[PDB]
Amino acid sequence: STGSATTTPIDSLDDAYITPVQIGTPAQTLNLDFDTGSSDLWVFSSETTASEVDGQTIYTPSKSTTAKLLSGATWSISYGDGSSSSGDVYTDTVSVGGLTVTGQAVESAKKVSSSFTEDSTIDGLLGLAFSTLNTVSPTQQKTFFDNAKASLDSPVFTADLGYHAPGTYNFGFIDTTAYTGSITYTAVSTKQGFWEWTSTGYAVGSGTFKSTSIDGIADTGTTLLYLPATVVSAYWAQVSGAKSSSSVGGYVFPCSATLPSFTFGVGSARIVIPGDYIDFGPISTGSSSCFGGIQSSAGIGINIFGDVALKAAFVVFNGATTPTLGFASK
């Protein structure tokens, strides 16, 4: 089997991408944030505290003839940005782009933190990291991909995120028309539960490539590119007037600037992030200070190849017995 679904930016900055997902019988379609940095499929629901729902579409398990309470199971998650959610668990039928999994754990939120409530465009998350990170207790549950894997034509999914435009998530096949050149594959460590890999270096603009190992994670659920402070300083030094602002929370730059590109290495191959992709717009409405899309990871504990980086590439998440990642230009 295969599936193919379009993923759409939630706003004009590509802050996140939403993909429609069919849950239950008859289908309830919710727009979920596909997140290769986590491993829970959780949704706003009829059980979510009413004051914490503000415009999201909810899953109502009592209206699904295939929903079953997973007795005794609870979940609770905290994300790298400080947000969180928790609740109980149903199993139900879940379909993405024509690919159907029966018995998928659907984690129903009883509580969500304010950042989720305040974003009416995201109805929940669909985790695509390794199932070892799933938070369901006392019986850990499998991701949608893990459940689908055995049925897929090939045990892979691909992320093709657009710049200021829709893109595609495919399951079970590589669309050879979706990229240019060849795909370069690179080793993955699953020891922390992430799609963790080592970039071979970077360049700023037209500058020379610096060969250096940068370990990090491919994370579709993080907006920006978070890299070591040395690398980030080298980038922003090429933008007149750019500076790190403790009060804003990162590097800012004059909105009048033209940003240089940023290149990262995948083996001997190179992925170029155009300068435009690094502009996240005014820090507040009407400001001439703009927020940068490359930020320091120093306070995180891990480097993160988020959407800024991934949307410059066609990305293969190869879930074979020994997983690997592939990157192609497009």
Short mmCIF file of C-alpha atoms in Angstrom, two decimals:
data_model
loop_
_atom_site.label_atom_id
_atom_site.label_comp_id
_atom_site.label_asym_id
_atom_site.label_seq_id
_atom_site.Cartn_x
_atom_site.Cartn_y
_atom_site.Cartn_z
CA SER A 1 0.00 0.00 0.00
CA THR A 2 0.86 3.69 -0.24
CA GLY A 3 -0.53 7.03 0.87
CA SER A 4 -0.05 10.59 -0.37
CA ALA A 5 -1.35 13.75 1.33
CA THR A 6 -0.85 17.45 0.74
CA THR A 7 0.55 19.48 3.64
CA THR A 8 -0.30 23.20 3.82
CA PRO A 9 1.38 26.08 5.71
CA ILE A 10 -0.78 27.42 8.53
CA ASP A 11 0.20 31.06 7.88
CA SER A 12 2.23 33.33 5.59
CA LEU A 13 5.48 32.55 7.46
CA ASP A 14 5.34 28.73 7.20
CA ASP A 15 5.26 28.55 11.00
CA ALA A 16 3.92 24.99 10.72
CA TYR A 17 2.21 22.71 8.20
CA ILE A 18 -1.13 20.91 8.53
CA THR A 19 -2.16 17.69 6.81
CA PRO A 20 -5.72 16.33 6.77
CA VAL A 21 -6.20 13.02 8.59
CA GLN A 22 -9.35 10.87 8.64
CA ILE A 23 -10.17 9.41 12.08
CA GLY A 24 -13.01 7.03 12.89
CA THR A 25 -16.15 5.75 11.17
CA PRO A 26 -17.70 7.74 9.58
CA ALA A 27 -14.51 9.73 9.04
CA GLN A 28 -13.81 12.80 11.14
CA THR A 29 -11.21 14.87 9.29
CA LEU A 30 -8.77 16.77 11.50
CA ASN A 31 -5.81 18.87 10.33
CA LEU A 32 -2.75 17.55 12.14
CA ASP A 33 0.84 18.77 12.45
CA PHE A 34 3.05 15.90 11.24
CA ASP A 35 6.02 15.90 13.60
CA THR A 36 9.14 13.80 12.95
CA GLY A 37 10.41 14.97 16.35
CA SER A 38 7.75 13.25 18.48
CA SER A 39 5.83 9.99 18.60
CA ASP A 40 2.28 10.67 19.83
CA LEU A 41 -0.82 11.04 17.66
CA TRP A 42 -2.98 13.33 19.79
CA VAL A 43 -6.08 15.37 18.97
CA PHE A 44 -8.38 18.02 20.31
CA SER A 45 -11.51 16.15 21.28
CA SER A 46 -14.94 16.21 22.86
CA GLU A 47 -13.03 15.54 26.11
CA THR A 48 -10.84 18.65 25.90
CA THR A 49 -11.54 21.23 28.62
CA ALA A 50 -13.98 23.58 26.92
CA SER A 51 -12.12 26.80 27.80
CA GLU A 52 -9.02 25.35 26.10
CA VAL A 53 -10.75 24.87 22.72
CA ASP A 54 -10.87 27.97 20.49
CA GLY A 55 -11.77 27.13 16.89
CA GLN A 56 -10.12 23.72 16.47
CA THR A 57 -11.97 20.79 14.96
CA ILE A 58 -12.46 18.07 17.57
CA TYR A 59 -12.54 14.28 17.48
CA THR A 60 -15.65 12.85 19.16
CA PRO A 61 -15.03 9.13 19.82
CA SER A 62 -18.66 8.48 20.81
CA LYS A 63 -19.63 9.28 17.20
CA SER A 64 -17.17 6.74 15.74
CA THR A 65 -18.45 3.18 15.49
CA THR A 66 -14.86 1.87 15.37
CA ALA A 67 -13.54 3.78 18.41
CA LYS A 68 -12.67 1.76 21.51
CA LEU A 69 -11.39 3.13 24.81
CA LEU A 70 -7.89 1.80 25.51
CA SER A 71 -8.72 0.99 29.11
CA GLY A 72 -6.41 2.50 31.70
CA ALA A 73 -4.16 4.26 29.20
CA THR A 74 -3.11 7.87 29.72
CA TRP A 75 -0.61 10.15 28.02
CA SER A 76 1.21 13.38 28.83
CA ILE A 77 3.75 15.17 26.66
CA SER A 78 5.94 18.25 26.90
CA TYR A 79 7.54 19.68 23.79
CA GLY A 80 10.84 21.49 23.33
CA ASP A 81 9.05 24.84 23.04
CA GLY A 82 7.49 24.49 26.50
CA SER A 83 4.01 23.48 25.31
CA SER A 84 2.22 20.39 26.59
CA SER A 85 -0.93 18.29 26.48
CA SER A 86 -2.38 15.20 28.18
CA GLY A 87 -5.39 12.90 28.27
CA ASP A 88 -6.68 9.37 27.66
CA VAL A 89 -6.52 7.05 24.66
CA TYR A 90 -8.81 5.39 22.12
CA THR A 91 -7.98 3.01 19.32
CA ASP A 92 -9.62 3.81 15.99
CA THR A 93 -9.15 3.67 12.25
CA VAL A 94 -6.84 6.39 10.93
CA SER A 95 -6.22 7.18 7.26
CA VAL A 96 -3.70 9.56 5.69
CA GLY A 97 -3.82 10.21 1.98
CA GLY A 98 -5.55 6.90 1.26
CA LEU A 99 -3.38 4.76 3.57
CA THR A 100 -5.44 3.17 6.37
CA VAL A 101 -4.32 1.82 9.76
CA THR A 102 -6.81 -0.01 11.96
CA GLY A 103 -6.31 -0.03 15.71
CA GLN A 104 -4.22 3.15 15.79
CA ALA A 105 -3.83 4.76 19.20
CA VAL A 106 -5.57 8.14 19.07
CA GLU A 107 -4.63 10.15 22.14
CA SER A 108 -7.57 12.33 23.17
CA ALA A 109 -6.60 15.57 24.90
CA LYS A 110 -8.26 16.42 28.17
CA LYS A 111 -5.87 19.37 28.66
CA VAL A 112 -3.72 21.41 26.27
CA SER A 113 -1.38 24.30 27.02
CA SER A 114 -2.17 27.84 25.96
CA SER A 115 -0.08 27.84 22.77
CA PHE A 116 -2.23 25.00 21.38
CA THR A 117 -5.50 26.71 22.34
CA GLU A 118 -4.31 29.96 20.74
CA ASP A 119 -3.59 28.26 17.39
CA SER A 120 -6.96 27.51 15.84
CA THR A 121 -5.40 25.95 12.70
CA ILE A 122 -3.81 22.88 14.36
CA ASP A 123 -6.21 20.16 15.55
CA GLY A 124 -3.46 17.93 16.99
CA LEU A 125 -0.14 16.26 16.20
CA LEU A 126 0.81 13.10 14.32
CA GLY A 127 4.19 11.91 15.57
CA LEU A 128 6.64 10.30 13.16
CA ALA A 129 9.73 9.82 15.35
CA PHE A 130 10.49 6.37 16.78
CA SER A 131 7.86 4.64 18.90
CA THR A 132 10.26 4.44 21.86
CA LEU A 133 9.33 8.11 22.55
CA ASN A 134 5.57 7.49 22.70
CA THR A 135 4.23 8.68 26.06
CA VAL A 136 1.23 6.35 26.53
CA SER A 137 1.29 4.60 29.90
CA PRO A 138 1.27 1.85 31.06
CA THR A 139 1.47 0.31 27.55
CA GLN A 140 3.50 2.33 25.07
CA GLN A 141 1.82 2.67 21.67
CA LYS A 142 3.13 2.64 18.10
CA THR A 143 3.18 5.55 15.67
CA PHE A 144 1.03 5.63 12.57
CA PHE A 145 4.12 4.88 10.47
CA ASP A 146 5.18 1.96 12.67
CA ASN A 147 1.68 0.46 12.39
CA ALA A 148 1.55 0.98 8.61
CA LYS A 149 5.12 -0.10 7.83
CA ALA A 150 4.60 -3.81 7.18
CA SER A 151 1.80 -3.07 4.69
CA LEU A 152 3.67 -0.38 2.75
CA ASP A 153 5.27 -1.13 -0.60
CA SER A 154 8.55 0.14 0.89
CA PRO A 155 9.10 1.00 4.60
CA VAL A 156 9.60 4.73 4.02
CA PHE A 157 7.89 8.09 4.16
CA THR A 158 8.98 11.33 2.52
CA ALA A 159 8.60 14.98 3.45
CA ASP A 160 8.45 17.57 0.66
CA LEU A 161 7.60 20.83 2.44
CA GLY A 162 6.89 23.95 0.40
CA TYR A 163 8.27 27.46 0.79
CA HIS A 164 5.20 29.67 1.17
CA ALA A 165 3.26 26.94 -0.63
CA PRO A 166 1.76 23.48 -0.05
CA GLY A 167 3.87 20.35 -0.19
CA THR A 168 3.46 16.59 0.21
CA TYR A 169 3.89 13.71 2.65
CA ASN A 170 4.11 10.33 0.91
CA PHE A 171 4.05 6.91 2.59
CA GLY A 172 5.44 3.73 1.07
CA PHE A 173 7.10 5.06 -2.10
CA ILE A 174 9.65 7.54 -3.43
CA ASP A 175 8.25 9.95 -6.03
CA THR A 176 11.22 10.19 -8.41
CA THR A 177 9.60 13.22 -10.13
CA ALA A 178 9.66 15.29 -6.92
CA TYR A 179 13.39 16.06 -6.74
CA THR A 180 16.37 16.90 -8.92
CA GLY A 181 19.64 15.01 -9.11
CA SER A 182 20.14 12.07 -6.76
CA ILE A 183 19.18 11.35 -3.16
CA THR A 184 22.13 11.17 -0.76
CA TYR A 185 21.53 8.81 2.15
CA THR A 186 23.16 9.23 5.55
CA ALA A 187 23.26 7.18 8.74
CA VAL A 188 20.73 7.60 11.55
CA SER A 189 21.10 7.02 15.28
CA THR A 190 17.85 6.02 17.00
CA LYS A 191 19.43 6.09 20.48
CA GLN A 192 17.44 9.19 21.53
CA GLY A 193 14.30 8.19 19.61
CA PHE A 194 14.81 10.82 16.88
CA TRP A 195 15.83 10.83 13.23
CA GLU A 196 19.31 11.86 14.36
CA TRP A 197 22.07 12.27 11.79
CA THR A 198 25.39 14.09 11.26
CA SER A 199 25.73 16.88 8.72
CA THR A 200 29.17 17.20 7.16
CA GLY A 201 29.41 21.00 7.38
CA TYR A 202 28.11 24.33 6.18
CA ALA A 203 28.66 27.43 4.08
CA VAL A 204 27.32 30.97 4.41
CA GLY A 205 26.27 32.61 1.15
CA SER A 206 28.94 32.24 -1.52
CA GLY A 207 31.60 31.51 1.11
CA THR A 208 33.79 28.47 1.38
CA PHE A 209 32.38 25.25 2.78
CA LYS A 210 33.49 24.44 6.33
CA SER A 211 33.87 20.70 6.87
CA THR A 212 32.70 19.92 10.40
CA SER A 213 30.43 17.28 11.91
CA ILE A 214 27.08 18.67 13.13
CA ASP A 215 24.88 16.10 14.88
CA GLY A 216 21.20 16.99 14.85
CA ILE A 217 17.65 15.81 14.25
CA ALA A 218 15.37 16.07 11.22
CA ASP A 219 12.28 17.62 12.84
CA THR A 220 9.28 18.64 10.73
CA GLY A 221 7.53 19.87 13.88
CA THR A 222 10.10 22.63 14.58
CA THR A 223 9.84 25.79 12.49
CA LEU A 224 13.43 27.01 12.52
CA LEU A 225 17.00 25.76 12.06
CA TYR A 226 18.85 25.53 15.40
CA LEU A 227 22.63 25.11 15.15
CA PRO A 228 25.72 25.64 17.31
CA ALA A 229 26.40 29.22 18.36
CA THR A 230 29.64 29.35 16.33
CA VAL A 231 27.80 28.48 13.10
CA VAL A 232 24.91 30.86 13.80
CA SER A 233 27.25 33.75 14.61
CA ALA A 234 29.13 33.13 11.35
CA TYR A 235 25.84 33.34 9.43
CA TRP A 236 24.48 36.53 11.02
CA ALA A 237 27.87 38.27 10.81
CA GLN A 238 27.17 38.48 7.06
CA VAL A 239 23.98 40.53 7.62
CA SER A 240 24.62 44.20 8.40
CA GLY A 241 22.87 45.21 11.60
CA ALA A 242 21.94 41.69 12.70
CA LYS A 243 22.36 40.94 16.39
CA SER A 244 21.28 38.53 19.09
CA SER A 245 18.57 40.11 21.23
CA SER A 246 18.09 38.62 24.69
CA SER A 247 14.78 40.49 25.03
CA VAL A 248 13.36 39.17 21.76
CA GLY A 249 14.82 35.69 22.23
CA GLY A 250 17.27 35.28 19.37
CA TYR A 251 18.89 36.83 16.35
CA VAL A 252 17.05 39.71 14.71
CA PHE A 253 17.99 41.67 11.62
CA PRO A 254 16.87 44.81 9.79
CA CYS A 255 13.84 44.03 7.68
CA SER A 256 15.54 46.03 4.88
CA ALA A 257 18.35 43.45 4.61
CA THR A 258 18.81 40.90 1.84
CA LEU A 259 19.74 37.61 3.54
CA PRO A 260 22.48 35.27 2.27
CA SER A 261 21.81 31.61 1.63
CA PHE A 262 22.93 28.87 4.02
CA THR A 263 24.28 25.52 2.79
CA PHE A 264 24.44 22.32 4.84
CA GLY A 265 26.27 19.13 3.94
CA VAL A 266 24.77 15.65 3.58
CA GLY A 267 27.74 13.40 2.95
CA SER A 268 29.47 14.89 -0.09
CA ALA A 269 26.20 16.53 -1.23
CA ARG A 270 25.01 20.05 -0.41
CA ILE A 271 21.55 21.44 0.32
CA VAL A 272 21.16 25.20 -0.23
CA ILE A 273 18.63 27.13 1.87
CA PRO A 274 17.85 30.38 -0.01
CA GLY A 275 18.16 33.57 2.00
CA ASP A 276 14.43 34.29 1.70
CA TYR A 277 13.66 31.10 3.64
CA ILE A 278 15.50 32.56 6.68
CA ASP A 279 13.22 35.63 6.98
CA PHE A 280 10.50 35.22 9.63
CA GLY A 281 9.23 38.76 9.38
CA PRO A 282 8.69 41.58 11.84
CA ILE A 283 9.08 40.72 15.51
CA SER A 284 5.78 42.55 16.12
CA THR A 285 3.34 44.10 13.69
CA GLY A 286 4.86 47.15 12.01
CA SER A 287 8.36 46.66 13.39
CA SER A 288 11.41 47.08 11.15
CA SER A 289 13.25 44.42 13.19
CA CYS A 290 12.79 40.96 11.65
CA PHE A 291 13.21 37.55 13.29
CA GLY A 292 15.86 35.21 11.92
CA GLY A 293 15.23 31.65 10.80
CA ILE A 294 18.62 30.34 11.92
CA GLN A 295 19.02 30.41 15.70
CA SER A 296 21.41 29.03 18.30
CA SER A 297 20.78 25.58 19.77
CA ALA A 298 23.00 26.35 22.77
CA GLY A 299 20.05 26.39 25.18
CA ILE A 300 18.35 23.28 23.74
CA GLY A 301 20.88 20.47 24.10
CA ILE A 302 20.49 19.26 20.50
CA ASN A 303 20.79 20.75 17.02
CA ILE A 304 17.51 20.79 15.09
CA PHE A 305 17.10 20.69 11.30
CA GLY A 306 13.58 22.10 11.38
CA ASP A 307 11.34 23.28 8.57
CA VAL A 308 13.71 26.07 7.42
CA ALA A 309 16.22 23.39 6.44
CA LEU A 310 13.89 20.54 5.48
CA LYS A 311 11.78 22.61 3.08
CA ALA A 312 14.89 23.20 0.95
CA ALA A 313 15.05 19.44 0.28
CA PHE A 314 13.14 16.32 -0.61
CA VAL A 315 13.65 14.22 2.52
CA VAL A 316 13.40 10.41 2.77
CA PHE A 317 12.73 8.88 6.19
CA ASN A 318 13.81 5.28 5.57
CA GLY A 319 12.36 3.02 8.26
CA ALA A 320 14.15 -0.16 7.20
CA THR A 321 15.59 -2.41 9.92
CA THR A 322 18.58 -0.05 9.99
CA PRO A 323 16.98 3.37 9.41
CA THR A 324 18.64 6.03 7.24
CA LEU A 325 17.79 9.55 6.02
CA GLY A 326 17.96 10.73 2.42
CA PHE A 327 18.21 14.30 1.12
CA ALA A 328 17.83 15.58 -2.45
CA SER A 329 17.65 19.06 -3.91
CA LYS A 330 14.39 19.98 -5.61
#
